[PDB]
Design a protein around this ligand. Structure first.
Ligand SMILES: CC(C)(COP(=O)(O)OP(=O)(O)OC[C@H]1O[C@@H](n2cnc3c(N)ncnc32)[C@H](O)[C@@H]1OP(=O)(O)O)[C@H](O)C(=O)NCCC(=O)NCCS
Ligand SMILES: CC(C)(COP(=O)(O)OP(=O)(O)OC[C@H]1O[C@@H](n2cnc3c(N)ncnc32)[C@H](O)[C@@H]1OP(=O)(O)O)[C@H](O)C(=O)NCCC(=O)NCCS
Ligand SMILES: CC(C)(COP(=O)(O)OP(=O)(O)OC[C@H]1O[C@@H](n2cnc3c(N)ncnc32)[C@H](O)[C@@H]1OP(=O)(O)O)[C@H](O)C(=O)NCCC(=O)NCCS
Ligand SMILES: CC(C)(COP(=O)(O)OP(=O)(O)OC[C@H]1O[C@@H](n2cnc3c(N)ncnc32)[C@H](O)[C@@H]1OP(=O)(O)O)[C@H](O)C(=O)NCCC(=O)NCCS
Ligand SMILES: N[C@@H](CCC(=O)O)C(=O)O
Ligand SMILES: N[C@@H](CCC(=O)O)C(=O)O
Ligand SMILES: N[C@@H](CCC(=O)O)C(=O)O
Ligand SMILES: N[C@@H](CCC(=O)O)C(=O)O
Lengths: 424, 424, 424, 424
């Protein structure tokens, strides 16, 4: 395609990403070849786009290309490397090699890059009778010092090394470290730059987009490395990171493609928040009435009635949290088998703006599609934009199902009519 | 002595040092033993005293304990190490070992420590037909980024490594690098932490305090290493650093002793600014008269006269810059061979507050001492504090030389009389 | 001792004190002699160490050296001086004498000193049928204006005088005023600079360190002046000040000695927060089990069992607040009468980091010492640092009590073993 | 008049005064009666109007009501009070009485008031054989600390007391002190609040407004007190203060009346900057031509000619600084004896915007009025607003002098015509 077209395509993603925090967990093998040069350039570009950037790299594989290729075997109790004094010292050497390399590649492809004593570590201790030695986990992260650097526009570079109150240095696991730092920062995004195209489905295909539940159910039959990825990704989400992404940092330009295109390569994982929505039953009616009545009083919701609701309760859905009712919505059907109507949509005023409405509309379109409905109408006197911004197109009265058209005419309400087309 | 006494002794030096910038050039051998632990603690303390701190270390000796002890000989065209790709890579490893070590020693003896891509380097090129390879000299220092970190209270850590626009890393000479960074920052103080007690005199004794001229004349007969120290120290001073100090960072606690005691160990070098002061001659008189006359009009300076000055010109000194006269002072003598008087002290109003006065008083006490005078009087109607703050003690009229006592009585001026005791 | 040694001794206290707020309540007799010069110097030094400083002085004794020595007797309903218009006016004169004196002593031993209209006062009214006249108590303190000055580095000087909405000035009690200002600032430290070596015990000895409970029980048999000191000190602590100290500002250098040495002269008072820890009984077991079980599931705590706990309940302690259980710990004993083991230490995750653990360990060492135990072991797979940072030294398996050594061998857990030596 | 009218009258002066610095030198007798209450209220109001306020008071008269009324006579070598240790101590007492009084009066008529160690003093020494003792003059003012307080909105209160490096306090002369502080701040305004209606003319009348030259020539025959006022006022102006005002702080509301009405009570002194304007002669013509020619080329200035100028040189004025010509303007006359025209007005582009034009117009209206002209025309193609904003009203062609009307018609230029009426 054309430059202008590509750039106008990127523009909304640039808008979304600007001023947000991205923690990048970087596989240490990427900092070794000329994939390094490609990466510094793309990270330099991200810097230039107003993205706050914290980069953390791994060391394990480099240590093994020093260990294994020597006559010493690494031990990996839960993927956590046992790391002795000699391995610890190598990691310190590698971390300096790598930060220097990155800095040089960034200077030749002027972007401020900073590193500091941000992590305080503790040893993992003893996993399964096996002393883990210098394998440490982040005990405290200096969030104030980090924010202060990101705020000034600095790129933050972190090795997989933390120090302790006992004046020791510990070896950190990168995959776990990035997710920990990401949660501490409440980073909007965690990115793992791996050697893999992302997480694959049981049928072999690349999982473009996953819920944390979907991710979780895949780990049941997944290799060790990818199980740990998921575990860290899920804990990040649960800890407040908005989105976790898995990419192949060996695929030239994949970071740009992931962040700035609708399509995006790799795997994207996000947490589905908890909103129990269920078929309404008999006992819901007073809760539904109390919610609906103010609105029916205001001329926003059509007048219902204890009897209407009792005899049509099956067409209502209700949204609940801790026994508390907070929303409702009905699916009305017609002689036209293809047609449905979202009716009686309502969120308690105290619970609004937090997405509850959208979840009710979604649940009802799932229900509508479940029964063969490809066309979903909404009629509203005062609330038409909400629908128009969520996939509804203006429609005319002559377009309604015949019986609805008749109610509409005799109403006098002249409500706006919108239709959304539901895919098979 | 007692704690309270020691601490009250330190207090003025703490006051002087607070909020000032100190660049520490650190010999790489100090970061190797438990002298490291001692150093982090003392630097941590300096941090806590509101000193802005930039630390730079060397690598040469570590590289040789890797080179020489391998079967490769280092070459040192002007003390500048030829550094190939393999040596460059080692320096990157060492710099990571050392920054990690320092960070750990600082954490266990919470003080924010930061490092960044502050230096951009260029290669030295070819010294004397000898390709110097990866030996680079600082081309640009990011002074804004540095100030921003020091201002926030961060300790700044720098390796002896700069990068270039060509995406290469270069090996920097520490002694030269610190002096360059120090000038860029206009640091009040540069400290070299060496393995030596400082700079020695021709008679073998430690030069406690040196002018840059004194330092310069010592290099004539000095070993190579100490010649380079001086050269860098002198260029720092000439470049605006206020004071350069040389210490043995192997002498436990020497950094504290140097910064916070009157005595201070090690060598201190400062630049004597240019103030040509000479015996007045015949042709000076109009310049002297024009200066003196306003003051004599105001009742601050005793009335002189073209004839007085013509017949006493030999007792005047004058301070000049670019042919321009800016100050004068006279030495009056008495029948009491031990007694002198500083007379007719005056700095042009446009040239005041810049130390000119003090240099005139000093020059005259040097002249007074040259002729056997151990007691120097100053009489002033309005300017008595200036003398009292520069070593003069209140005296009485009955204490004057006899003939001066007589002039004083018949004057009516009742000027304050102060005496300073001049040492033999 | 040596300078370096003294200064390295001070360094941790300098670190702790930097950027903290200290409110100094100063007896007015200290501002009268050359103890004034000593004090300005030490307060100047504290300024230079990044301590935020609010100074308040008293006036009572000066007023009496004007009253009593005139033919007027002061009346002191609860140590609160009745203060008429004539006494009020003297206090205004004294406050100006004293602020000028202090300012001059500070300038000659450049440190910014500021004072302002920070206190608004109200009269105390009528104590016990006795009109108290111009004796006022702080009604409002301008905390924003105060913070603004401390933040800029200014020393804050306050007289014992507040003004009112009725355009009157009132006489404040210093001891009460400092404690009020200290609470308003949530100052980490309140210091009273008195003419006494601090608070004495019933046996005559100087109470180096007191809890607020200890302070309280001393007042039962204490002189009036010291009763009021305690009362104000205790209310400061209860109001959020971290530590209150009582010193003799007539003992040359005592402020430095108190703030910057382990030993410290004078009396230190701190509030013991509320943590009810008691012998576990039968009914605690479900609460203990629920806490312990997650941890035993994770391989951090040895598997217990409803029966184990039922038959060993006497060796458990539990920490509770509002009936809620938040922590537990057991003392295990051995055939070696000198040996104990802290077992089953656990704080609810929701209640962690707030010191609960430390209080459980302390309680158990108190229990261990109560039965003759001088050696206390801790064995931990993942939690060994916590112990090592709280006085435990690494030990070997051959060092365990014999039966514990046997369990340890057959476990397979390879837990780290640490010992703490308990003093008699 | 009406409130709305008064307030709309004040509005431009409020606009001018907002964010400006005013140093108020306050006679110590004003802080003694209920003139104090009036003053705090008016100063409180000024605070509320965004005026940055530095207040300094005197003490002399209070000291004499303590001296003279005791049996000790004050000595006043140049109006500078000899002040011994006993007088110095009284001044410290008075300064505290007075600051407390002011603070209380300000609180009861919430406005932040701050004072600090801003002045460092030196003794005056010996005037005329007379030791002046504790009479000190400001040696250094802490301008940074002062700006920092004014910037935060604080009112700054200063006593007439400075301290020295020798740990002494000195007695400052208020009149001199305010003018010194005012210059240090480059205050736009210095106000002296005296017991007099301002400076009187030789004919007895109150000098409403004076140049510094006018002020200077009045001192020739003026009382001592008013001579010193002038001397300080003039040195303030010369030192960069924009305006000095003298008022009676005993005239209820005079500070408001001076600052916020066109009329304003009291005396106002301002420095006439140096702009030598003289009759042009023969040798000026090339300088005039070079200036005029660019403009005549642009169609802004009517074409002149070496001959025109040679034969009309007497009607030109020229503005010069250091021999350099920077402006010119001509006065054209007509058969109508009442009519004049400002012709050929021009300032060198490099010297514009600095008031030169206005001074040329003024000089020519002075010349026009000197010969009986009450009507002054300006004709301009592109520059008509400049005139309209400096007192010119639009006029028509039928309104020109007859011969000018004829030139105007045949020109084709259609320049805008404006007239200013010159008062007799
Ligand atoms: C429209 C409604 C159901 C939305 O419920 P919700 O819980 O807020 O749903 P969401 O949080 O997913 O959507 C919230 C967004 O919808 C927008 N919105 C709400 N009412 C709107 C309206 N009347 N017109 C346009 N937009 C509206 C909100 O302003 C909010 O904007 P934001 O994305 O810029 O923050 C609303 O809460 C409601 O119940 N209104 C009265 C009942 C009603 O009108 N029902 C049905 C319409 S026929
Ligand atoms: C006193 C004088 C000679 C100082 O010359 P100088 O070039 O300023 O000398 P320095 O720069 O070394 O000293 C400057 C310091 O002296 C201080 N000083 C100057 N005059 C002073 C005085 N009259 N009283 C007290 N201190 C004074 C300045 O304020 C300045 O203070 P700082 O250290 O706080 O900045 C002054 O310039 C002068 O010539 N005054 C008139 C002549 C006179 O009085 N001569 C002789 C005295 S008998
Ligand atoms: C170790 C434990 C008992 C501490 O309880 P607590 O209520 O937090 O006790 P305190 O608040 O007095 O101590 C808190 C400090 O201990 C530190 N700490 C906690 N776990 C640690 C560990 N595993 N390793 C090192 N330090 C640790 C905390 O990080 C905190 O650090 P800070 O001083 O830097 O803030 C922890 O709460 C716990 O119960 N962990 C699981 C149970 C366990 O391991 N029990 C016994 C060990 S055999
Ligand atoms: C008009 C002129 C003589 C003003 O001289 P000057 O030295 O700037 O005079 P002042 O400094 O007293 O007045 C400066 C103010 O006049 C304003 N001014 C200048 N030219 C102006 C114009 N053409 N229209 C409106 N206002 C103008 C300036 O913008 C400045 O504005 P400020 O008060 O908002 O800063 C101008 O310099 C000049 O010589 N212009 C070309 C010659 C010309 O037009 N001459 C005569 C007019 S027939
Ligand atoms: N959508 C509203 C009715 C609005 C209308 O039909 O005008 C409801 O379901 O009650
Ligand atoms: N020191 C001044 C004279 C002052 C005096 O003697 O009173 C001078 O040398 O002229
Ligand atoms: N301290 C743990 C046991 C850990 C171990 O012995 O390895 C407990 O008391 O249960
Ligand atoms: N005022 C201009 C002439 C402009 C005009 O008359 O149009 C001059 O004096 O030359």
């Amino acid at each position: 395609d054309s430059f202008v077209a590509h750039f106008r395509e990127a523009a909304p993603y640039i808008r979304q990403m600007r001023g947000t925090t991205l923690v990048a967990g970087i596989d240490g093998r990427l900092l070794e070849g000329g994939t390094l040069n490609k990466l510094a350039a793309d990270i330099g570009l991200l810097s230039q786009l107003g993205i706050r950037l914290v980069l953390i790299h791994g060391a394990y594989h480099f240590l093994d290309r020093l260990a294994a290729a020597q006559g010493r075997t690494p031990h990996y109790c839960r993927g956590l490397r046992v790391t002795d004094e000699t391995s610890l010292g190598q990691a310190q050497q590698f971390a300096g090699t790598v930060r220097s390399r990155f800095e040089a590649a960034l200077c030749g492809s002027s972007v401020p890059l900073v590193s500091g004593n941000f992590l305080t570590a503790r040893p993992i201790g003893v996993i399964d009778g096996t002393d883990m030695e210098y394998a440490g986990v982040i005990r405290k992260t200096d969030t104030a010092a980090l924010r202060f650097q990101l705020d000034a526009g600095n790129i933050v570079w972190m090795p997989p090394l933390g120090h302790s109150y006992g004046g020791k240095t510990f070896n950190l696991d990168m995959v776990q470290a990035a997710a920990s730092v990401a949660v501490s920062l409440q980073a909007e995004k965690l990115v793992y730059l791996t050697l893999s195209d992302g997480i694959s489905r049981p049928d072999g295909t690349l999982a473009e987009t996953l819920s944390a539940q979907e991710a979780q159910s895949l780990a049941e039959h997944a290799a060790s490395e990818t199980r740990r990825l998921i575990s860290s990704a899920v804990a990040a989400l649960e800890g407040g990171v908005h989105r976790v992404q898995i990419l192949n940092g060996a695929a030239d330009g994949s970071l740009l493609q992931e962040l700035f295109t609708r399509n995006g390569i790799g795997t994207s994982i996000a947490k589905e928040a908890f909103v129990s929505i269920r078929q309404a039953h008999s006992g819901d009616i007073p809760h539904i009435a109390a919610l609906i009545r103010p609105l029916e009083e205001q001329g926003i919701l059509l007048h219902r009635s204890r009897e209407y609701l009792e005899n049509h309760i099956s067409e209502f859905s209700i949204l609940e949290h801790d026994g508390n009712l907070y929303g409702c919505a009905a699916l009305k059907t017609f002689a036209e088998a293809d047609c449905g109507e979202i009716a009686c949509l309502a969120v308690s005023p105290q619970a609004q703006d937090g997405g509850y409405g959208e979840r009710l509309l979604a649940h009802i379109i799932d229900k509508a599609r479940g029964i063969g409905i490809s066309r979903l109408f909404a009629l509203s006197t005062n609330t038409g934009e909400w629908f128009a911004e969520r996939g509804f197109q203006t429609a005319s009265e002559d377009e309604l199902p015949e019986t609805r058209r008749k109610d509409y005419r005799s109403n006098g309400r002249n409500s706006h009519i919108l239709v959304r087309r539901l895919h098979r």
